[PDB]
């Protein structure tokens, strides 16, 4: 399932790069996404609303759409999101291990090229 704590391994190219993110399934199929982030150290939570289409969720009042895409590598997923002052979109590779082993990058690369993002720069976190 997609619930768990997910650590960012690679992203196409701040705020967007906060890691890890924890996803909890809510009654009805929606998900809560939560991270910890001028001031105090604080948890920040948001609901991803399930749609009628498998793997597709919406957020921020419908202005954000997130797709959860399977990886061939166990305990990894790819997240593809489209959002908005200008329109923005990007692909993230995530996994359950805190250590970044960069062993699922082929699928990240393929997901990006399938969506017209094959020339964007990639950001690789080393630490949370």
Residues at the interface with Cl ion (CB under 5 A)? 9, 95, 97, 101-102, 104
Q: 19 vs 5, 8, 86, 124, CA distance in Å?
A: 9, 6, 24, 11
Q: How far is the CB of 42 from Zn ion (least distance, A)?
A: 28
> Where does the chain have alpha helices with state H?
105-114
Q: C-alpha angle with apex 88: 85 to 92, nearest 5 degrees?
A: 140
Q: Give which of Cl ion, Zn ion, none residue 11 binds (C-beta under 5 to 8 Å, depending on kind).
A: none
Question: In angstroms, rounded to a whole number, what is the distance separating the alpha carbons of residues 38 and 106?
Answer: 37
Closest approach, Cβ 53 to Cl ion, in A, equals: 26
Instruction: Tell me which of Zn ion, Cl ion, none is bound by residue 107, counting a contact when its beta carbon lies within the kind-specific cut-off of 5 to 8 angstroms.
Output: Zn ion
Among Cl ion, Zn ion, none, residue 128 binds (CB under 5-8 Å by kind): none
Question: Which of 45/96 has CB closer to Zn ion?
Answer: 96
Contact status, residue 68 vs residue 79, Cβ threshold 8 Å? yes
CA separation for the pair 45, 115 (Å, rounded): 28
Indicate the residue among 31 and 104 with the shorter CB distance to Cl ion: 104
Q: Whose Cβ is closer to Cl ion: residue 65's or residue 104's? A: 104
Q: In the complex, what is the shortest distance from the CB of residue 99 to Cl ion, in angstroms, rounded to a whole number? A: 6
Q: How far is the CB of 108 from Cl ion (least distance, A)?
A: 8
The nearer residue to Zn ion, 10 or 23, going by C-beta atoms, is 10
Q: How far apart are CA 50 and CA 128, in angstroms?
A: 28
């Amino acid at each position: 399932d997609v619930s768990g704590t997910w650590y960012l391994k690679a992203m196409t190219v701040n705020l967007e790069s906060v890691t890890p993110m924890t996803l909890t399934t809510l009654e009805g199929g929606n998900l809560e996404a939560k991270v910890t982030m001028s001031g105090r150290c604080q948890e920040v939570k948001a609901v991803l609303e399930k749609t009628d289409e498998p793997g597709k969720y919406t957020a921020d009042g419908g202005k954000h759409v997130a797709y959860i895409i399977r990886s061939h590598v166990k305990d990894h997923y790819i997240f593809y999101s489209e959002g908005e002052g200008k329109p923005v979109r990007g692909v993230k590779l995530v996994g359950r291990d805190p250590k970044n082993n960069l062993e699922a990058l082929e699928d990240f690369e393929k997901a990006a090229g399938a969506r017209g993002l094959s020339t964007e720069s990639i950001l690789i976190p080393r630490q949370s």
